[PDB]
Amino acid sequence: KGEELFTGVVPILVELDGDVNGHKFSVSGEGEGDATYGKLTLKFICTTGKLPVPWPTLVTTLVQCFSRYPDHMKRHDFFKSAMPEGYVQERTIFFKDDGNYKTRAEVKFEGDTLVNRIELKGIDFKEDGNILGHKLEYNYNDHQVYIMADKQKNGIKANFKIRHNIEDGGVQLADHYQQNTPIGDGPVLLPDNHYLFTTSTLSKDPNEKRDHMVLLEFVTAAGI
């Protein structure tokens, strides 16, 4: 089983290559995950300069295999069952009255490390909007993810809203549409519909001078 590969603390590598309205950038993340408790600690660095989009808008893009799946639904864990070969994770994210991100990522083990490798393309963004204009608060409003099976492609799908607080009043809406399919061929668990509940805390490394985001996350799956 792929679930075995998560019994301990697992190092996490994240790598994003991004293009939004022609502003190209890269993001690297390193940290570790504990699926037994459902805990992620990661530090992200924009390794090419200033991040041209706000850090919270990338949170969902930047490893649901680390969700704590209890004992009674260790069998609906599609994300772990796909390991080590892993899965493709694709999204479109509509920023209301603004552009959209399209993301394709591969989530897999490379040696002992869980690696989330992402390409991100963003189009139709307003240059003085909340994204390209950096008008969103540095914080997070988590949202639950209702995970439904997708027997057709043999993976799962979800759609959910993320709310970003706008520095001067609004809420910026980020409409997420997600589908996941296994990379490998072997048997994979197809879950009964269930929820993923996530708690995210954003913070800053006082000794770090590059543009960056420290992220602490707790996540659990739930029935009904």
UniProtKB/Swiss-Prot annotation:
Effect annotated for changing residue 140 to A: In Cerulean; leads to improved quantum yield, a higher extinction coefficient and is 2.5-fold brighter than ECFP
Phenotype for residue 143 to D: In Cerulean; leads to improved quantum yield, a higher extinction coefficient and is 2.5-fold brighter than ECFP
Listed GO biological process terms: bioluminescence; generation of precursor metabolites and energy
Listed result of changing residue 145 to I: In Azurite; shifts the excitation and emission spectra to shorter wavelengths and increases quantum yields compared to BFP
Consequence of changing residue 140 to F: In Sapphire/H9-40; exhibits a huge Stoke's shift, with an excitation peak at 399 nm and an emission peak at 511 nm. In Azurite; shifts the excitation and emission spectra to shorter wavelengths and increases quantum yields compared to BFP
Protein name per Swiss-Prot or TrEMBL: Green fluorescent protein
Gene: GFP
Result of altering residue 150 to V: In EBFP2.0; shifts the excitation and emission spectra to shorter wavelengths and increases quantum yields compared to BFP
Tissue spec. comment: Photocytes.
Effect in UniProt of substituting residue 98 to E: In mut1.27; shifts fluorescence lifetime from 3.03 to 2.85 ns
Record annotation: effect of changing residue 148 to T: Increases fluorescence at warmer temperatures such as 37 degrees Celsius
Subunit structure: Monomer.
